[PDB]
Amino acid sequence: NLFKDAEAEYRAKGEESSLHIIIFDELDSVFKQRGSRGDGTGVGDNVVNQLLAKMDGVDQLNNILVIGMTNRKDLIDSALLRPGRFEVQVEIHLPDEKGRLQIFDIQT
Amino acid sequence: DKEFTKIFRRAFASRIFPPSVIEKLGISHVKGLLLYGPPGTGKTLIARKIGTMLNAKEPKIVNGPEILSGSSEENIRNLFKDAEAEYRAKGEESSLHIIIFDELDSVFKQGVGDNVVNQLLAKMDGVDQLNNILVIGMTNRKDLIDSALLRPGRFEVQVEIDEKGRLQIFDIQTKKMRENNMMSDDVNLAELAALTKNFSGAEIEGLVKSASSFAINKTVNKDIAKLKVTREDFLNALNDVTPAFGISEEDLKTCVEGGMMLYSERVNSILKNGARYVRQVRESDKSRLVSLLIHGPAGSGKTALAAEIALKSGFPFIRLISPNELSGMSESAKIAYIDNTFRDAYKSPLNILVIDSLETLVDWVPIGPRFSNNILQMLKVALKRKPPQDRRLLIMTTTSAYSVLQQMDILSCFDNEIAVPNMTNLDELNNVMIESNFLDDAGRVKVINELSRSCPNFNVGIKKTLTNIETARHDEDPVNELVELMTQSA
Ligand SMILES: Nc1ncnc2c1ncn2[C@@H]1O[C@H](COP(=O)(O)OP(=O)(O)OP(=O)(O)O)[C@@H](O)[C@H]1O
């Protein structure tokens, strides 16, 4: 239900469609490994399948950029770490001394 | 092509004969074909091409993970309705139906994933004699396949899935940019192929996009006509993408990083003997296994010499077994790593294998004495095993504890020994000094005079000489350092 606006604008205006960006906080919360097992309600697996279907079989939606912020990459399902799905991964590490000075300046 | 011939000749031959003969004799057509290999080999491509090439029924492509849904069993059983009805209508005349299940191991692991197996096994064999259905199972991980399916009569045939092809796919990708006169002539595609050794198609697309990205950056902080992709972007973008392979040929090149000096003729003699043995292995058809031992005082330099001989050999296959690779492993892991390293040397017409510091692999310490008997026995057995038919090995092992090996009685396993004595005459020191351009002529003439009056017999290893020269270069370039230091290391 989140992608309806992008689909509508794409269908309406071809390549003139503006850029729509949606960002998923706490990505590892729901999209854990889809082979966890447990013999119970499967709503924790069809969620990944739905997102993967709307992200891979996009039907040529080329005006969407999803940003995912997390603290533990290892827990993310491996199926989403491949070309065409979350390609670029940027690591943010601890600041350097000059960055420390910049942060101190900004804070004060 | 070889697999393409095997699968066609052996499996897909029975259907050619007139149907009545098959019906009468009772010969049974092979049912299962398992194509396996690393990701990106194109297993899906081959699966698709097989159906069209053989003029078979339109393939039913179904994703492995999508199988997840009693409705899963309903789908599995419904899959076979068309083939069952078609065979019922005609019989032996039914056309060949092919079903491909991508990522078989995803759902067919050792309870939807169990009921699916139940349905498939119930339909596949027993009451049914449908020889018109061919199921192709493709998986990147062969070990994960259920044992219930790994048995005779099911998936009998297993098939395992280059530089030129890589260049061709590069051309395929580049066509659009090259045609529109936006590519500089300096870019050598073959060079990029030589750089990309362990990359798959998606990685190639990624490198293309990143290299273009650098050209994009060059413009943005109406001259769009000058947007050109340069070789520098291709060189720079290589840092983003990464492969998932490994090579040890580099390890055999770093061991000689310090280079040769030819400070004495015996070095040339040893090299000559090595080139003789390599030729002997190359030419004789009876000598299918040659073992050599290279022994000498510690620090004289033995790994570098063997690595040099191996690099001069030029054989298709060369490898090194060094302690560094085994560090941190448990015993049951070392014994398997050593076994695998040997088992991978029997798949090529000519092979060279180098073993480094034999006594260190065995964990020898003289206080006990303590050592690991299992690895010792494994190596002793391996060093005498003849390779399979028509394949030839050359093994060179380096050691520094000749006496210990004598005690263990392992010495009977080697065919010949080569001794490498460390330099003792000041002439060799002069050669090394001129080779290392340590000092001018006057200093290099005074050093010998200073030494001759203090230490007539030199007896120092080359490694120590090099390190001493390096450390003396800084404190006091004049002789007043070196002669002392070396006298201290005598
Ligand atoms: N025959 C040789 N001629 C010239 N340089 C050599 C020769 N052998 C070894 N060296 C130099 O010695 C350096 C280190 O020697 P190397 O590692 O082979 O010693 P080693 O005696 O095998 O060592 P270890 O003491 O670990 O048993 C190499 O970088 C190489 O440049």
A74 three-class SS: helix
> By what technique were these coordinates determined?
cryo-EM
Looking at residue B286, its amino acid is K
Question: Minimal CA–CA distance to B413: which of B438, B443, B382, B444?
Answer: B382
Per-residue b or e along B433-447, where b marks 16 or more CB atoms closer than 10 Å to that residue's CB: beeeebbeeeebeeb
Q: What are the contacts of B50-56 at 24+ separation with CB within 8 A? A: B50/B98, B50/B136, B51/B98, B54/B12, B54/B96, B56/B95, B56/B96, B56/B97, B56/B98, B56/B134
Angle in degrees, CA A15, A21, A24, rounded to 5 = 145
B111 touches chain A (CB under 8 A): yes
Nearest to B202 among A35, A79, A83 (CB): A83
Q: How far apart are CA B236 and CA B213, in angstroms?
A: 11
Parallel, antiparallel or unpaired: strands B317-321 and B350-355: parallel
* Cβ atoms < 10 Å from Cβ of B327: 8
Contact (CB, 8 A) for B482 and B446: no
B295 three-class SS: strand
Q: How far apart are CA B118 and CA B134, in angstroms?
A: 18
Angstrom CA distances, B110 to B150, B152, B170, B324, stand at 11, 18, 41, 37
Ligand 1 near B443 CB (within 6 A):
no
* Cβ atoms < 10 Å from Cβ of B310: 23
For the four alpha carbons of B39, B40, B44 and B48, in that order, the dihedral sign comes to negative
Q: How far apart are CA A93 and CA A86, in angstroms?
A: 20
Q: Left if phi > 0, otherwise alpha if psi is -120 to 50, otherwise beta: which for B155?
A: left
Q: How far, in whole angstroms, is CA B423 from its chain's centroid?
A: 38
Establish whether the linkage from the previous residue to B369 is cis, with ω within 30° of 0.
yes
Per-residue b or e along B381-399, where b marks 16 or more CB atoms closer than 10 Å to that residue's CB: ebbeeebeeebbbbbbbbb
Contact (CB, 8 A) for B109 and B66: no
Atom of ligand 1 nearest to the CA of B299: 21
- The residue whose CA has the least distance to atom 2 of ligand 1 is B260
Per-residue b or e along A37-70, where b marks 16 or more CB atoms closer than 10 Å to that residue's CB: eeeeeeeebeebeebbeebeeeeebebbeeebee
- Please name the residue that has the structure tokens 């199988």: B67
Packing angle of the helix pair B112-124, B71-79 (nearest 10 deg)? 30
Q: How far apart are CA B296 and CA B433, in angstroms?
A: 23
Contact (CB, 8 A) for B310 and B274: no
Question: Minimal CA–CA distance to B234: which of B197, B202, B199, B193?
Answer: B193
Contact (CB, 8 A) for B70 and B115: yes
Interface test with A, best of B63, B68, B208 (most A CBs within 10 A): B68
The DSSP element (H or E) to which B191 belongs, if any, is: helix B189-195
Angle in degrees, CA A24, A28, A31, rounded to 5 = 85
Q: How far apart are CA B485 and CA B489, in angstroms?
A: 6
Nearest to B206 among A35, A39, A83 (CB): A83
Q: How far is the CA of B356 from the centre of ligand 1 (A)?
A: 12
Contact (CB, 8 A) for A20 and A9: yes
Q: How far apart are CA B329 and CA B89, in angstroms?
A: 62
Q: How far apart are CA B148 and CA B249, in angstroms?
A: 41
Question: Minimal CA–CA distance to B189: which of B210, B171, B165, B212?
Answer: B171
Helices (H) and strands (E) in chain A, counts: 3, 2
The DSSP element (H or E) to which B133 belongs, if any, is: strand B133-139
Q: What is the resolution of this structure in A?
A: 3.7
Contact (CB, 8 A) for B438 and B471: no
Q: How far apart are CA B440 and CA B424, in angstroms?
A: 23
Angle in degrees, CA B254, B256, B261, rounded to 5 = 155
**Interface contacts (A, B; CB < 8 Å):** 14
Per-residue b or e along B266-296, where b marks 16 or more CB atoms closer than 10 Å to that residue's CB: ebeebbeebeebbeebeeeeeeebbebbbbb
Q: How far apart are CA B261 and CA B436, in angstroms?
A: 9
Question: Minimal CA–CA distance to B173: which of B211, B201, B210, B213?
Answer: B201
Parallel, antiparallel or unpaired: strands B32-36 and B157-160: parallel
Task: Name residues whose C-beta falls within 8 Å of residue A30's C-beta, 6 or more positions apart in sequence.
Answer: A44, A47, A48
Q: How far apart are CA B384 and CA B374, in angstroms?
A: 16
Beta strands in A1-108 (DSSP E): 20-25, 64-69
User: B396, B462, B468: which to mutate for ligand 1, most atoms within 8 A of CB?
Assistant: B462
Q: In chain B, after which residues does the backbone break, taking C–N over 2.5 angstroms as a break? A: 69, 110, 161, 221
Atom of ligand 1 nearest to the CA of B463: 12
Question: Minimal CA–CA distance to B303: which of B408, B202, B398?
Answer: B398
Q: How far is the CA of B441 from the centre of ligand 1 (A)?
A: 26
Contact (CB, 8 A) for A53 and A61: no
Contact (CB, 8 A) for B47 and B138: yes
For residue B402, report the phi and psi dihedrals to the nearest 5 degrees.
Answer: -40, -40
Task: Name residues whose C-beta falls within 8 Å of residue A98's C-beta, 6 or more positions apart in sequence.
Answer: none
Per-residue b or e along B192-221, where b marks 16 or more CB atoms closer than 10 Å to that residue's CB: bbeebeebbeebbebbbebbbebbeeeeee
Angstrom CA distances, B454 to B156, B254, B449, B450, B477, stand at 79, 37, 9, 7, 20
Residue B132, judged by CB atoms within 10 A of its CB (0-12, 13-18, 19+), counts as buried
- Please name the residue that has the structure tokens 């000041």: B426
Q: How far apart are CA B264 and CA B428, in angstroms?
A: 7
Q: How far apart are CA B333 and CA B281, in angstroms?
A: 32
In this complex, do B205 and A34 lie within 8 Å of one another by their Cβ atoms?
A: no
The DSSP element (H or E) to which B116 belongs, if any, is: helix B112-124
Question: Minimal CA–CA distance to B317: which of B244, B393, B257?
Answer: B393
Write out chain A residues lying below 8 Å of B68, CB-based.
Answer: 42, 45, 49
Looking at residue B135, its amino acid is V
**Distance from A34 to chain B by nearest Cα, in Å?**
9
